[PDB]
Amino acid sequence: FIVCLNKVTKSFPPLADRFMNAVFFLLPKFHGVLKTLCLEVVLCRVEGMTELYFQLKSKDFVQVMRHRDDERQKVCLDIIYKMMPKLKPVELRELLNPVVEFVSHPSTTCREQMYNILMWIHDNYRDPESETDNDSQEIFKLAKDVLIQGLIDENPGLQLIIRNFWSHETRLPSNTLDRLLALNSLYSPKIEVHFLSLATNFLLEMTSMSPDYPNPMFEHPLSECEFQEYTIDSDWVVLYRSYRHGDLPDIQIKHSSLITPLQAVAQRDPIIAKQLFSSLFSGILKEMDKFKTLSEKNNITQKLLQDFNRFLNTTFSFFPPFVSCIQDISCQHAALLSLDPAAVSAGCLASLQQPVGIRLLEEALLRPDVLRWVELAKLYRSIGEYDVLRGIFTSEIGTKQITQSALLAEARSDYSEAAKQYDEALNKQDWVDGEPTEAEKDFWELASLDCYNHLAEWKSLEYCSTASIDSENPPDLNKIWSEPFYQETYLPYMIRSKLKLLLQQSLLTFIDKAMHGELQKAILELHYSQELSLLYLLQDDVDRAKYYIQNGIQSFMQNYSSIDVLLHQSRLTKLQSVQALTEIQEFISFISKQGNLSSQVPLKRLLNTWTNRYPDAKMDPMNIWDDIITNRCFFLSKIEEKLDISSLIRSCKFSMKMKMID
């Protein structure tokens, strides 16, 4: 019955108009391909059901969505497509909520269908004009984000039509100025890697209407000869410049003939993408410089600063090219020089783009000013501009002395008495400056932490993590403590403290809280994956440690690729993580040979190895000393035990101490 009914409904839709009850009395009884045929019949006569959302209530559309079938799921999506014109907005986003998780599926056909759904919504139902309730705004945000992710379809035609859909004056207004304004408001928190590339793509494809862009820029060749397309062998690249070639150099090439290769390289090369984006944006600024009203100009700069916030706030990788582009764009423009010093500081620090923001903040100072000063000081400490830092904390905003005596300690690198000064007077708020800035307060907290991390005082590292800080938060910290920004700064120190204490538990609490919320885990693996590897290699769940170490190798490679190498200190610090990564990876790989794992031949010959390969601190920062010390001690304690002896281990402890001394 139902098989021939699904066979005839396509053959004749009207005949299905007598067995709605039959399928509805059987749809929650039909669960195999019978369910598929029920979907076929429903789709063919969805108009036959004036109200069938209550079927979804009763027939559990959601459970069908759990099923994996481009057939079943896609035809359900098509049914919704038929009935979403008639669907109520509340039911509409109700159905949307389970839909959104299906994006980016290898089906690419039911995926394509639901992307059609999303664009249709953003066109007529989730469209920016139907935004009357938070329902509608949420729907439109979801649709715009998923179609943003659709700009990058592995299907070039699909993403191409998506680009056409967007660039359309409805979705993206036609005028270059207002197109730009919409682009500033259209960034997705995950696309800053290619947000600039796609924005350039849209901007340049607008130039198509320019009835000279497809024309040549030159018509007066200095050397004129025959110009015909040139060929090239491409045995197992597609052309973007035809090479109308000959004896003499032509100059009558089209503007398009250059722009299209230019657009392709821009959308492919991110660094050139951001350079081009900055240049074009500035040129647009000159375009508005003709006669445009400064009221509109400052409104645009305000909304652009807000956009920059929504970029930095919603980014967590902090794309070093994107971050640098935003920084310089702020640099060249006074109304754009109004950045939050804390925001640009954090962006530089997460992007290792410190000096660019240092120049930006320098322009800001020479243009609050105390916050600008303290952020410049924070980055100077991070890099090591301790000389100008001394000048600043003696002249600009630095009126204290514990800050300055600890500055002397840090220049003398004996952080011990620096932290003694700070933890001595860090909880007290009265000072010669009255109230020092809370930035200076958490700077003192971070200096005490940097001491007790520099020293082997991991117990006092956790102690200054918990109590020695100002009593602005409970001692221990977890995901419920990430909201304070200083705690976010402390997090690498937090993992350091707890990992070394275990190497000597709120750590595991925050670890599970880090898997709880993939942003936390992503950031941790981006910046502390090797610490996790050392932990879970010490925690003896070494499979997790190997997982963390491979993820950390990939994160290091990707960060070093993204983070500019010309900032040679940043690149050097990036490559200082090599020792622990290799430690964990190679120890796991070699641990298959467990014969030389507890015997004394990995002890007598390999204990002196504890303290043979030790650098000098000038070329190896002493935090990386703590790193490599943990690495080597882990090596030659794990390889000497758990399948010359004691005096040699004591000698190696002692020699490690002299190397600490040197």
Partner 1 sequence: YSGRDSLIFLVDASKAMFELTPFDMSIQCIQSVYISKIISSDRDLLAVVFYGTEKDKNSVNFKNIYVLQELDNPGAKRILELDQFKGQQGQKRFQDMMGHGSDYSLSEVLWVCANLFSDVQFKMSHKRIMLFTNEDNPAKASRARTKAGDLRDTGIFLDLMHLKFDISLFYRDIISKLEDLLRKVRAKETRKRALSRLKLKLNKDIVISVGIYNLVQKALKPPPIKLYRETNEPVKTKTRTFNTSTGGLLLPSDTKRSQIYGSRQIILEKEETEELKRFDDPGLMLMGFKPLVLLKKHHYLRPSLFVYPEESLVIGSSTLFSALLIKCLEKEVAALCRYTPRRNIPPYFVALVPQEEELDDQKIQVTPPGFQLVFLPFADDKRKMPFTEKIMATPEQVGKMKAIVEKLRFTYRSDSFENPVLQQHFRNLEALALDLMEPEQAVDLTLPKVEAMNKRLGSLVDEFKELVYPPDY
Partner 2 sequence: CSLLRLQETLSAADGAALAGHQLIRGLGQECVLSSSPAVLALQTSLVFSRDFGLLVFVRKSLNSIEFRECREEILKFLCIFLEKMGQKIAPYSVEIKNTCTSVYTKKIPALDLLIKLLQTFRSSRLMDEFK
C-alpha distances in Å from residue 353, one per residue of 5, 217, 553 = 66, 38, 21
Residue 550: contacted member of partner 1, partner 2, none (CB under 5 to 8 Å, by partner type):
partner 2
Phi-psi group of 484: left, alpha or beta (phi > 0 → left; psi -120 to 50 → alpha; rest → beta) = beta
Site string for partner 2, 16-55 (x = CB under 8 A): ----------------------------------------
CB-based contact 534:581 (threshold 8 Å): no
d(CA 515, CA 524): 10
In the complex, minimum distance from the CB of residue 156 to partner 2, in angstroms, rounded to a whole number: 25
Find the part of the chain contacting partner 2 (CB under 8 A) among 152-160, 271-279, 295-303, 545-553: 545-553
CB-based contact 621:579 (threshold 8 Å): no
Check binding of 57 to partner 2 (CB under 8 A): no
Site string for partner 2, 507-526 (x = CB under 8 A): --------x-----------
In the complex, minimum distance from the CB of residue 549 to partner 2, in angstroms, rounded to a whole number: 11
Q: How many residues does the chain have?
A: 662
Find the part of the chain contacting partner 1 (CB under 8 A) among 50-58, 154-162, 239-247, 642-650: 50-58
d(CA 454, CA 617): 12
In the complex, minimum distance from the CB of residue 28 to partner 1, in angstroms, rounded to a whole number: 5
Q: Which of 543, 586, 641, 644 binds partner 2 (CB under 8 A)?
A: 543
For 79, half-sphere exposure in the C-beta direction (CA atoms, 13 angstrom radius) is 28
In the complex, minimum distance from the CB of residue 585 to partner 2, in angstroms, rounded to a whole number: 13
CB-based contact 659:629 (threshold 8 Å): no
Q: Give, to the nearest 10 degrees, the angle between helix 33-44 and helix 2-11.
A: 30
In the complex, minimum distance from the CB of residue 25 to partner 1, in angstroms, rounded to a whole number: 5
**Residue closer to partner 2 (CB basis): 176 or 550:** 550
Find the part of the chain contacting partner 1 (CB under 8 A) among 1-9, 17-25, 471-479, 557-565: 17-25
Q: List Cβ<8 Å contacts ≥24 apart for 505-512.
A: 506/476, 506/477, 506/478, 507/535, 509/476, 509/478, 510/477, 510/478, 510/479, 511/535
Residue 130: contacted member of partner 2, partner 1, none (CB under 5 to 8 Å, by partner type):
none
Q: Which of 2, 8, 22, 542 binds partner 1 (CB under 8 A)?
A: 22
CB atoms inside a 10 Å sphere around CB 500: 20
CB-based contact 656:611 (threshold 8 Å): yes
**Residue closer to partner 1 (CB basis): 58 or 302:** 58
The residues pairing with 229 across neighbouring beta strands, listed in sequence order, are 244
Q: Which of 7, 12, 25, 424 binds partner 1 (CB under 8 A)?
A: 25
Per CB under 8 A, which of residues 60..79 are in contact with partner 2? 63, 66-68
Residue 618: contacted member of partner 1, partner 2, none (CB under 5 to 8 Å, by partner type):
none
Instruction: List interacting residues with partner 1 (CB under 8 A).
Output: 21-22, 24-29, 54, 57-58
Instruction: List interacting residues with partner 2 (CB under 8 A).
Output: 63, 66-68, 515, 543-544, 546-547, 550
